[model samples]
Target chain A: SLLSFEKLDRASP
Target chain B: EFTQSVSRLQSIVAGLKNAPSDQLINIFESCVRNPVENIMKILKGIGETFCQHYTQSTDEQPGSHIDFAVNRLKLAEILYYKILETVMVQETRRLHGMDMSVLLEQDIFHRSLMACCLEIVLFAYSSPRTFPWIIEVLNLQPFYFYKVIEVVIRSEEGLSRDMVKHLNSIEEQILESLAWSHDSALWEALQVSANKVPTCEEVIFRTGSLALFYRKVYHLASVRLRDLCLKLDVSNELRRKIWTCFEFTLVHCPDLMKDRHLDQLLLCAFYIMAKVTKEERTFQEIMKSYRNQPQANSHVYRSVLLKSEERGDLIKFYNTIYVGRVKSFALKYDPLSPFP
Candidate 1:
């Protein structure tokens, strides 16, 4: 599975 | 049906204007529910629930549950986005002026399916919940997850034309990359004292957006999995069916091993593929995959308990395996399979 998730941990734009 | 975008926007604006304090405070409650986008959303939903309950009770300080829930999603999303960038860049380069069509379109689609799973995770964490059968079931595993690659290669049901082209491009690269092959020299060299020192808070502060997003996911995931296993009606056939899968893991119950095996798996897989493919394959991604593993399980209830504290080194230690560098390692299977 090459699926990569977007971490919601970003500085919340 | 007055379902125009303008009216929809107006309704949304009005709702925002009169939105209740609780809903306004966080998306957890309003967004998370039974029909979640995916596992990430479910974890986020759990975070939302923790927040909502704490806020409703007006507790002086939110508890461990609150922090872990929020951090898992936040950190998971952070790592996930980074992965997307690398994947897209590599995919574009891989596709490079080629006519992506026919039985050859497969390899790229596998990568796309992985993207689908990650996107699903993002949607799940933001709003929090499942999609009945859901759209992005493949993200549940990382690229080396043998099962995911097998399934994606065989299936092409929900893919749009655009998705098909994008995925094929990546699929070609991955096959050519041979990312999983072992490099004894590189593997041995990683031990040249490239230490991944852990911070004290790896456990102290794992809530609200960055639970260190390491192997903690695997620990939690296994617990959740074992818990589900316990509740199955022993009379059902699925009990044995699931156990068959569990046999692969050394411990009888997921709770028993606590990731001694998972960490090794992560490092080994990371060591092999880091050189070949461009997927994130980071420590966080491995942990996130660990967390999502249970979602595929059929049991609805869980009995696994969270440990007292999460060590931040799980992620650091995972990343430590390749302190030097990873190499391209993959399978040498027969080329003439029905599906690529």
Candidate 2:
């Protein structure tokens, strides 16, 4: 299962 | 990391294909509540299902060849768009923002998604379907364009012969998408229009694209060797065999063919021929033919030349030189040098 969409918050902003 | 992401994506898409279609909307509806995470999983599941229908397992049982495959593919198609609709939501795109451009460039998640879509487009169309929409949905990173070419060459699993022509739309998409005149554009554009399989010249004429990078310093050394072939004392067979070194070096170790390291490439080539041929006459010619003769007490000559004369197994002979010898000579050679 995919982790939360908020996990994308860690995507090198 | 890129590899693992793709593997995970492949698994998700495969799972979706195997999931019961009647329950697909229910599964997707549940995903909407946890949109970010669950949507990704749902897309992967549907993509996974698409993979089951169209990707790797082309194995036929006592089977329903067309209808079973086609019906399954149609089911996979509806779910594919379902995946696209989920991912393309304005909110989802904003959440995937920041490094989204970079991630989209190489992410296995997007790559697998593109791969699934390539088969979907290929399988779903009666005419060649142009997927301009895929670029927007998958964030248009140009990665999927290449994957389209890959699918045409590699994945024919459940497809019929005549259906193969529809893949040309992927090629046509690439033609319009890429506009440079570099070998990348030229080569890809040439591939897009290929009626029969295109040859090297068919791609970019005699100039030979970026694939010629390996031959730079080596070409100069080879021309010098050709000049040395002018030596009346050199054996015609031995002279020709030494030229084979140029091909071997270019194919196997272009990194070692550097300007200053040309001597090493030349010596390594001779060293290979001497070891594999185990022909003292060949070694005698190596001593006579060039200015850099093996030293009177040279271990390089003795070590390589003493390998017993074996029957011609060109592949094993190449291994002895490249794997056994030249690699140690140039320890830092890069096998993964880029081409197209």
Candidate 3:
């Protein structure tokens, strides 16, 4: 879950 | 290496010692002859030298060495143009036309030279000392020139006052060239860059440089998405999650935003993120999230696309959007996570 959130987080900015 | 300078000068002088009666004829004959191959040869060497020096020493630092670099760079640029000018002039008159295109195609060194010439001119364009002079020597297609300017503008760091003046002049030139070409997407991006317009209203209508196009639209999309989340009354925690989903989408493939259902897709992605964060059975959890959307929110996303389309502003957006599928879109997201 944290990995997905992190991947998404890094993807946007 | 021991040869006397006088002997070589004397040999050159002896060769030049045409009789008075023959001098004018020799001069005229040489003038009338096309020496294009020779010029290209010389230009290739100059360009190669330019590339070497450029990669070695030029402007790898801040100040004072600029003048030295400019002189060598300026000479290389001049010789390249001199070759082109000579070819154009002489070959146009000859029964057989000069195939000058080979200079770029067959000549690897020449391409390297053009690349170097482009780079140095970009740096020199910042110095008032070399501004405008280097530009005159670059015989680039308008598209090529614009791309080089794009590179320079993107890479440039903090500028001295002189550099700002240089950049301003270059910007004016870009505006002039873009005006001549009537580039729509780049124009909008330029307009957006100048802060003269807001959002993707004028941008994303057409495309020129894909990277540049995506970059500008990505900025607009992020801002709008954040504003949209705020409007939806999503809590900060949920909004942050939504922001991450939208960002990853852009980060992975900003070009995918070309969709009629960009809002819905984003809302879908946000729900997916929420599920991924809170649940364990990723795919099933995402299916639940996908179905969890209230009718009110679905209407909002569909309404945004429909209204924009009614205004005729959504033509390009919808066409690009309709081509993409969830499967392709998911390729940009995590497989084991909830992504809709």
Candidate 4:
């Protein structure tokens, strides 16, 4: 799997 | 007796100012055969005088007394590293048991020579024209040359295009032996940045703001991170995520890149990256990779740990990043994109 900005965005507190 | 030998060595080094290069090796051989007391002090004196000449020569026209002084200083540097090479060979032989000694006299001598050479090289970084000669002298040990170049680059001074080219070639030759997987990308980034060698004014601005040093620190930190990832044999995906987290941390909170905080900052970045990606990597396992690395500064490590334990700043910063409170840089290119 590649980097997911979407995942990082969702993980944001 | 000690003073006598030191004064004798001083005069010998002084005489080297007028001597030709072909005879330097013989003189250096003779100098190393008789161990002198406080030789580092004499070398430091030579380095200081060299810097003095360097400053004076930069101010005047071509045909002046300062020109002679500059020539002499170059010869002094050549003599300094020649002696260093001689002692290094002797120390290597001792390690092979060709010669045995109860005391580490050769080791002490070798370490002092190394320290003195580094001091001289640091001073030489002020004059870009001296680089060709410096490279010639230091090419004896490519790794040591790389270390000197690393220190010079991290000092954030503006390098000449010629100096940068020579340094890049030397780095390529040395890093090729390390067989780092990302070596090509790293080399490309270095070359890309080499296009715009910062001007003296720009260097001063960056120095004053303390931002320029962080860029080089981040570069070195990434190299260290790559080494750790390779040591851990982590997957390429995991390594990618760790690098992303590392860059994100730097982009958002660059104040964390202090010289003392470097190891811990990178360590914390690794841990947080692993955690955020749901990977199982223990602190102890990560810490093990940090040990025994040549670049590991133990004094900085101890101080950073003591202050960090009391203040919990590193932990606090780590938690902030873990919670994704820190915003990443809006990079124009892909964050994970490979360098050309």
DockQ values, each candidate: 0.03, 0.01, 0.05, 0.04
lDDT of 3 by residue, B1-340 (tens): 4234223323322333212224223322345353345445645554455444444534533234545555545543543343233333444433263343443234433433344334444553343434333333333333234344433333333223444354544534433222223333434444455523222323433444434444444453454445554543556565555555555554444334322334444554654554445322233223224334322232333233333245222222233342242324433444231111
Stretches off by above 4 angstroms in model 2 are: A1-13, B1-74, B77-129, B175-340
Measured by DockQ, the strongest candidate is 3
Tens digits of per-residue lDDT for model 2 on B1-340? 4343234334435545533354334333444242344434655654554434433333441222455545544454444444543443333444553323332233445444444554554444431223543343333433234443433334433333333444444443343222212323333533454412222223323233223322322344455565555653455566555555444564444332221123434544654444444242243344335544221223222223213363322223334444554544333321221111
DockQ of 4: 0.04
Candidate 3 chain B lowest-lDDT run of ten: B12-21
Provide the lDDT at B36 for model 2. 40
Model 3 scores a C-alpha lDDT of 0.39
Residues B1-340, candidate 4, lDDT per residue (tens digit)? 3343234334445544422244334333344353334444555554564545445444332223566455545554554555544343445454464532322235333333443344343333343433233333322333233444453333323334444444554454333222122222323432456423333223333342123433444455667777887877878777766666555554544334422345556676676556445565445455546765664543333333222345333344444433344323322222462211
> TM-score, each model?
0.18, 0.25, 0.23, 0.38
Q: lDDT tens digits, residues B75-96, model 1?
A: 4333333333233334433347
For each candidate in turn, the interface RMSD (Å) is 9.0, 22.9, 13.7, 12.1
Give, for candidate 2 chain B, the lowest lDDT window spanning 10 residues: B331-340
Please list the C-alpha lDDT of all candidates, in the order they appear: 0.31, 0.39, 0.39, 0.44
Task: Score candidate 2 by lDDT.
Answer: 0.39
